[PDB]
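Duplicate of earlier report; Eukaryotic translation initiation factor eIF-1 input re-posted below.
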Amino acid sequence: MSIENLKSFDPFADTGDDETATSNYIHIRIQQRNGRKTLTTVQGVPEEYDLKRILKVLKKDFACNGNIVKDPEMGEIIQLQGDQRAKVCEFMISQLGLQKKNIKIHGF
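Output:
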């Protein structure tokens, strides 16, 4: 007589598939507003990237929340909840392939 038992298992490792995308400046800024919330505004992103897909990635992988909004001064932009400037910079570099030199980060 005998019995079956698990010998080992595979981890999370896999090969890379990233590639360089074309230059164009992006601005990631922090907001201060009368509702007391801190928000991250994303501006200048290439129109070939769907803003609704940016929302979907930042809600799925980063666990944030956000919307597309038209500001009186800053124009049509994505708002994300909190100070996510480094996180959104990393998304544009990692998932879109945009080179780091294109991304401006601004405080408040």
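The chain has one domain: 1-108.

Merging into the original ticket.
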